[PDB]
Design a protein around this ligand. Structure first.
Ligand SMILES: O=C(Nc1ccc(C(=O)NCc2c(C(=O)O)sc3ccccc23)cc1)NC1CC1
Length: 167
């Protein structure tokens, strides 16, 4: 038993809710919140910009130190940093950005990072400003993640479309 509430169960291990991931993280304080990161951990907009703003820019300060030490992530890769006031940990995962021409097959590799964590709060990777089809992103998530994932979808219209079209 865990503290996530109001989710629709899609599969044995995947759950989904129309929710603002920032507000969900603050309420649940999950062990892991997933950030829709870029390779530079520049959290300017989308989910990343919102998460970082909620931490009063502490996420960005920590991230800049990480990059200065380690260099950029790979597309499809991840790193674990602090969750600040939102979670124990933040798993920063880089899905391919279609608006940069990155290979959509890297989406599966991105979701594989979720399997290193028993339970996660996450957005749909490569959705929103990353330019991928969220329905496809949900399918890859369901077909790749084996651990327990609670998906927060900000847009109500999109959430209803994801549920109604789910096979
Ligand atoms: O900006 C904020 N949040 C916020 C911003 C952006 C996103 C986001 O990229 N989602 C991904 C997404 C969907 C959705 O979630 O709609 S459908 C879909 C389909 C394919 C791929 C992805 C995808 C998520 C959350 N919050 C600040 C105002 C307080």
């Amino acid at each position: 038993v865990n503290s996530f509430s109001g989710y629709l169960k899609l599969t044995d291990n995947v759950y989904i809710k129309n929710a603002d991931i920032v507000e969900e993280a603050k309420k649940v304080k999950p062990t892991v919140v997933v950030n829709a990161a870029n390779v530079y951990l520049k959290h300017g907009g989308g989910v990343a910009g919102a998460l970082n703003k909620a931490t009063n820019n502490a996420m960005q300060v920590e991230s800049d130190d990480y990059i200065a030490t380690n260099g950029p992530l790979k597309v499809g890769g991840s790193c674990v940093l602090s969750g600040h006031n939102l979670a124990k940990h933040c798993l920063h995962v880089v899905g391919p950005n279609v608006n940069k021409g990155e290979d959509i097959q890297l989406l599966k590799s991105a979701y594989e990072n979720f399997n290193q964590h028993e339970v996660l709060l996450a957005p749909l990777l490569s959705a929103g400003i990353f330019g991928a089809d969220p329905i496809h992103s949900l399918r890859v998530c369901v077909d790749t993640v084996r651990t327990n994932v609670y998906l927060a979808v900000f847009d109500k219209n999109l959430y209803d479309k994801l549920v109604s079209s789910f096979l």
